[PDB]
Design a protein around this nucleic acid. Structure first.
Ligand SMILES: [Cl-]
Ligand SMILES: [Cl-]
Ligand SMILES: [Cl-]
Ligand SMILES: [Mg+2]
Ligand SMILES: [Mg+2]
Ligand SMILES: [Mg+2]
Ligand SMILES: [Mg+2]
Ligand SMILES: [Mg+2]
Ligand SMILES: [Mg+2]
Ligand SMILES: [Mg+2]
Ligand SMILES: [Mg+2]
Ligand SMILES: [Mg+2]
Ligand SMILES: [Mg+2]
Ligand SMILES: [Mg+2]
Ligand SMILES: [Mg+2]
Ligand code: NA
Ligand code: NA
Ligand code: NA
Ligand code: NA
Ligand code: NA
Ligand code: NA
Ligand code: NA
Ligand code: NA
Ligand code: NA
Ligand code: NA
Ligand code: NA
Ligand code: NA
Ligand code: NA
Ligand code: NA
Ligand code: NA
Ligand code: NA
Ligand code: NA
Ligand code: NA
Ligand code: NA
Ligand SMILES: [Sr+2]
Ligand SMILES: [Sr+2]
Ligand SMILES: [Sr+2]
Ligand SMILES: [Sr+2]
Ligand SMILES: [Sr+2]
Ligand SMILES: [Sr+2]
Ligand SMILES: [Sr+2]
Ligand SMILES: [Sr+2]
Ligand SMILES: [Sr+2]
Ligand SMILES: [Sr+2]
Ligand SMILES: [Sr+2]
Ligand SMILES: [Sr+2]
Ligand SMILES: [Sr+2]
Ligand SMILES: [Sr+2]
Ligand SMILES: [Sr+2]
Ligand SMILES: [Sr+2]
Ligand SMILES: [Sr+2]
Lengths: 119, 246, 145, 115
RNA sequence: UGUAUGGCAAGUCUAACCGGAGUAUCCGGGGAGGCACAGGGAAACCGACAUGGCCGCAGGGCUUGCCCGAGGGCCGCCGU
RNA sequence: UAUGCCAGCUGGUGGAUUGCUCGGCUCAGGCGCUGAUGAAGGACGUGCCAAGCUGCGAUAAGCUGUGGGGAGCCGCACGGAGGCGAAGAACCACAGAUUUCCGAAUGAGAAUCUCUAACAAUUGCUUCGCGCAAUGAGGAACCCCGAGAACUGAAACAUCUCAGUAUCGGGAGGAACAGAAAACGCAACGUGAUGUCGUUAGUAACCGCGAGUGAACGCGAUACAGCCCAAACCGAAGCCCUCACGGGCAAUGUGGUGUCAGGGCUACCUCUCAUCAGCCGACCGUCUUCACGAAGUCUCUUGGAAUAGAGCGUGAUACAGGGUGACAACCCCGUACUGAAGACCAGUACGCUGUGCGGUAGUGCCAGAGUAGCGGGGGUUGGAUAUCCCUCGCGAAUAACGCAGGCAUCGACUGCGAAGGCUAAACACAACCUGAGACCGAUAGUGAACAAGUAGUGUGAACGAACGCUGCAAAGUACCCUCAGAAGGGAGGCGAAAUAGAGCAUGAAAUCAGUUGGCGAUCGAGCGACAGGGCAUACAAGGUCCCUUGACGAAUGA
């Protein structure tokens, strides 16, 4: 509704399909002009650019999209552990922008180029 | 007195007489009473559970075990106001009348007095509104209600030198206290009131702090928000006329 | 700053000793209790007084003074103007749920009036007859013999 | 504490007229206005007709109501008048606000106080 | 039942509820009924001074003690 | 100076304070029955590793189908291993499959098991066969019918009060109950079923006339709605089961007619649009859910991080709210506008189908009995002689008669037909759903923000807690040394921050250790107030203080 308690509640206790909207990010100039949207649900094949973190101004491929925790893994956006291993740093999608898309799916390519529907 | 009418471009388009009710004495004492009686009337009834802390068969062991006569159950002190997990002594009640009655004439006269406080150019600047204009209130033609875009209303208010007010009421204060945890995190200054005649301005209502009204029901709160008189209102030619018989 | 507001830190709150503000003893009973004994003071005596007659056999009259009719003559020009002819039945408010309209004689009569009502007093008459006028009774006021 | 701001202004205006001028009534009226609303003058016309003289301003330290008849050409002055009083006064005289009478008679002369 | 304040004033207030709406706020309507406007009497029943006199505070007037004297006080008369 | 006292300092102990909110509390709208087709609840199971919880049921965190959805996924819960998914998975909406045992529990017995065909029990119908059916039990409260306290008040107490309250027995539904006058009785030339809200009114009425108890007619409002038998007069013209044949019912009367605008029979005027049965069956609204949806993530500084500040720019029928490494209308979900579905309203309204409304005269054909009413005893009510009820006794009229209109009898007048029946809507409740808040904010608020009716107490009925916070990101501390050691320690590593390192935001007081200043082993006790000396003190937030001398100079005063 409008109550802060019931707002965060819906965002946490959200069914898996409704967690799709929680992993949405803004589209580039070229892409907003082409598909008629402003944002898209980030996919594991997409390439993207970081706008807000310490890693702002770096590009990379989206390696994972965890709906459960509502965050994305991007290539080369790593953290060095104590044993020298480089583990990924979870990024928020609202801190990211899509440069290139993955249209490997016929249903996603159909949903984006249709003015009535939104992907 | 005379009221200068304006067109949608911001230039003069004739003039009509400013009604008698704008010569009603500004009585902040009656206005403030009519606002406090309006605010308290929409306040919700609260109250703690009637049986809270009482859901126990706790009993005191009299005089003998070297302890104070406090009702106990399993070594824990229950019920009594002084004991932890006990009842509230004089708690907030649901049976309470949080509503304030106000005589019809006193409310009507207060509207009139608030409506009149809109005519004095000094009071409007004393209330807080930032503007550059001698004539107050702003009087616009009935062709105002036809506007749909808010960005065009801005251009009308920029032309009328009365936009420095929406520049003022843009900034938001983040309230100190636990009001945050209940929905009321923000607060913003009250600004311009757009009084129309047929339907409230769907075109203005999104402007920073701006409230919208109609002359058949424009109340003391709209005219004087928070009991403070002199709101920078903008009437429609048919509103200025209809507001007279109030 | 209210009285109740300044009561914190006072312990007894204006109650004297902490041994005072307890139960019904500090009151002297409950409610109206002890009305004949220790609290006979400013109480009406024990007993019954008079009788009541059934409510539908009770007559409620419509009272109006000659002073009220006279003060408002210039304001009442919607009624007959003779050589003033006025039906009192159409002047008094609450004239629907009343038994009969009685004109009382209290005050002065500086004008000439022709009054039409159900019942008149000896004083209502003397003040209108001695000030140039007539008192005409209604067909319902015929219950006087 | 008087909640009204204009009763508080009237009192202040009555006070300056009692000092800066030769008034001995305006200060006496202001002394009754400072006193509670229950002690204020609630008077009808039937008293103004009995006790007032022509060419003598009638001063009321309260409100004038409209019960009774007024035939004299008196100029009444009060804090407030009832809508029927003012109709019955302007019919045979002049209902003037006490706030006018201070500018119109700062000396406070030829004036009767009725309550 | 007092008191302080405020609106209205020989009147004053609406209740439930209806309409409107910016939809618990709020604007219009609603005077049912309550209190006041005459009392005395168990009841039947009857039914009063918009002022007649004398003082006199405040205030006003005057030719600066003398006038007019609200409210007030002491009587009359009036209703039962 | 040992024991030691006061204050501080570093570090603990402790978890107050501040900040935060997955929970509560309250209000409001919507909605509202389940069960022998075995409910509700329970037990036991069910996962690769599975203890709790959630789900599920031997097909066991799931199987099918339609629509939505979509690149992800395999609950709470971030493991390891492995798997599923473009054959469209996860997730969601609707419909369905499966659904152990105990459980009303119903073949019989039983601490969730066992024993040799089961509606057990009680009823209805009946092919008289358990053949077809019914009841049983659950649900927060509300509702209806019964049973029915005492504390308490009366300043004791007994009638009275508390109070038809508590508690108990029975029963229904989404609401219940009530209901179309043998009425009201502002007595009228008047109102015209029933609930409910306002008022009438703390009135009338009652009462050790004490304490206290307390309507109604009317009025204004909400919502509206009005009918069906019994009998007369017809007399099998009728009903139920079955595909049918057939069977069952019924003259102890099925069905027709009829029901105070009394009806029927006999003789005529006219006519129906009433009424009952039955078909059709929404709009609008409301409530919940969904689709769609504008505008920056530009410049410099600080910063770990820009949601900050300054500069530029932008939409707005959208400046409610939340998210996001800090104060965001333009980053993300949303919000306005527009549109879609379901439920509810409602099998109602409207329309339609059939029926037939109504009037005149004639006729003593018909109109509900232990009733109306009286008397004794009880109880209850405001019911006073004049409330409603139970109980014992007695007991009537037949419309040409009867009841009533706050005492009885008689006559008048006025109103109305008991002892048969049905009845929509307007209100109660809050389980359920969504919303709201000058409520609370972790010793609060529910007992319950956590394993919550958990742990745990009692033979049992029953009783019952405490526990919230690492970080932006686990980057959740590699390697080395030490040690008996996955301990702990040291060095070291990550981070803006480890005195953020695991009950890990902040970190008060009591109190502990180490230590600093003062005091201190010849000295006396409300621990201090006011004066005045020793010693001690980084800055900041205070900057004054001493002496010669001199000016002024009260009371007083050599
Ligand atoms: Cl009487
Ligand atoms: Cl008067
Ligand atoms: Cl009636
Ligand atoms: Mg598209
Ligand atoms: Mg508590
Ligand atoms: Mg607790
Ligand atoms: Mg605080
Ligand atoms: Mg069995
Ligand atoms: Mg007692
Ligand atoms: Mg009794
Ligand atoms: Mg006694
Ligand atoms: Mg009783
Ligand atoms: Mg009655
Ligand atoms: Mg029939
Ligand atoms: Mg800590
Ligand atoms: Na409990
Ligand atoms: Na103790
Ligand atoms: Na309340
Ligand atoms: Na006490
Ligand atoms: Na009446
Ligand atoms: Na009235
Ligand atoms: Na429901
Ligand atoms: Na059965
Ligand atoms: Na488990
Ligand atoms: Na199931
Ligand atoms: Na059988
Ligand atoms: Na007692
Ligand atoms: Na006793
Ligand atoms: Na008694
Ligand atoms: Na963000
Ligand atoms: Na009774
Ligand atoms: Na009897
Ligand atoms: Na009757
Ligand atoms: Na706690
Ligand atoms: Sr999940
Ligand atoms: Sr999770
Ligand atoms: Sr003892
Ligand atoms: Sr006291
Ligand atoms: Sr006595
Ligand atoms: Sr009336
Ligand atoms: Sr009114
Ligand atoms: Sr007098
Ligand atoms: Sr049953
Ligand atoms: Sr009706
Ligand atoms: Sr009958
Ligand atoms: Sr009688
Ligand atoms: Sr605690
Ligand atoms: Sr025991
Ligand atoms: Sr270290
Ligand atoms: Sr001693
Ligand atoms: Sr000297």
């Amino acid at each position: 509704s409008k109550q802060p308690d019931k707002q965060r509640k819906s965002q946490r206790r959200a069914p898996l399909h409704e967690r799709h909207k929680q992993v949405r990010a803004t589209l580039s100039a070229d892409l907003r002009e082409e598909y008629g949207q402003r944002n898209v649900r980030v996919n594991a094949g997409d390439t993207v650019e970081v706008l807000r973190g310490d890693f702002a101004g770096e590009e990379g491929e989206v390696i994972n999209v965890d709906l459960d925790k509502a965050v994305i893994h991007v290539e080369d956006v790593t953290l060095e552990k104590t044993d020298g291993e480089e583990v990924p740093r979870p990024l928020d999608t609202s801190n990211v922008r899509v440069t290139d898309l993955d249209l490997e799916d016929e249903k996603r390519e159909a949903r984006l180029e249709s003015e009535d529907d939104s992907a | 007195m005379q009221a200068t009418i304006y067109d949608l471009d911001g230039n003069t388009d004739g003039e009509v007489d400013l009604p008698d009710v704008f010569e009603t004495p500004v009585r902040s004492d009656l206005i403030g009473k009519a606002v406090r009686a309006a605010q308290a009337n929409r306040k919700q009834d609260y109250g703690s559970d009637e049986y809270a802390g009482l859901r126990t068969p706790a009993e005191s062991f009299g005089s003998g075990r070297g302890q104070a006569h406090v009702p106990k159950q399993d070594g824990r002190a229950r019920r009594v106001p002084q004991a932890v997990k006990g009842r509230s002594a004089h708690p907030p009640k649901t049976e309470k009348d949080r509503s304030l009655d106000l005589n019809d004439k006193e409310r009507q006269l207060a509207v009139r007095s608030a409506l009149a406080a809109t005519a004095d150019a000094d009071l409007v600047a004393d209330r807080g509104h930032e503007f550059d204009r001698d004539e107050v209130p702003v009087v616009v033609s009935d062709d105002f209600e036809d506007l749909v875009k808010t960005q065009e209303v801005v251009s009308l208010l920029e032309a009328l030198d009365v936009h420095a007010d929406i520049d003022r009421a843009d900034e938001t204060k983040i309230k100190a206290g636990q009001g945050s945890a209940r929905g009321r995190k923000y607060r913003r200054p009250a600004s311009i009131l757009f009084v129309t005649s047929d339907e409230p301005s769907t075109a203005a209502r999104n402007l920073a702090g701006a409230d919208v009204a109609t002359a058949s029901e424009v109340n003391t709160e709209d005219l004087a928000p928070g009991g403070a008189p002199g709101r920078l209102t903008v009437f429609t030619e048919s509103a200025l006329a209809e507001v007279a018989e109030r | 700053t209210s009285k109740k507001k300044r009561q914190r830190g006072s312990r007894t709150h204006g109650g004297g000793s902490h041994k005072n503000r307890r139960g019904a003893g500090h009151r002297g009973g409950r409610g109206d209790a002890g009305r004949d004994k220790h609290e006979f003071h400013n109480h009406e005596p024990l007993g019954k007084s008079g009788f009541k007659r059934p409510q539908k056999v009770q007559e409620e009259a419509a009272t109006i003074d000659v002073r009220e009719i006279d003060e408002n003559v210039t304001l009442l020009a919607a009624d007959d103007v003779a050589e003033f002819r006025v039906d009192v039945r159409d002047v008094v408010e609450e004239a629907d749920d009343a038994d009969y309209v009685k004109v009382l004689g209290a005050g002065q009569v500086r004008h000439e009036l022709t009054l039409i009502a159900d019942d008149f007093s000896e004083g209502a008459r003397e003040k209108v007859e001695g000030a140039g006028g007539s008192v005409e009774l209604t067909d319902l006021g015929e219950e006087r013999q | 504490s008087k909640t009204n701001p204009r009763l508080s202004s009237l009192i202040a205006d009555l006070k300056s007229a009692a000092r800066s001028s030769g008034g001995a009534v305006w200060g006496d009226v202001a002394e009754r206005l400072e006193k509670p609303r229950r002690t204020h003058a609630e008077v009808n016309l039937g008293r103004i007709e009995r006790y007032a003289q022509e060419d003598e301003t009638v001063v009321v330290p309260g409100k004038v109501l409209g019960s009774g008849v007024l035939q004299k050409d008196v100029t009444v002055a009060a804090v407030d008048f009832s809508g029927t009083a003012e109709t019955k006064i302007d019919q045979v005289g002049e209902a003037v606000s006490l706030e006018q009478a201070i500018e119109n008679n700062p000396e406070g002369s030829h004036v009767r106080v009725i309550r």
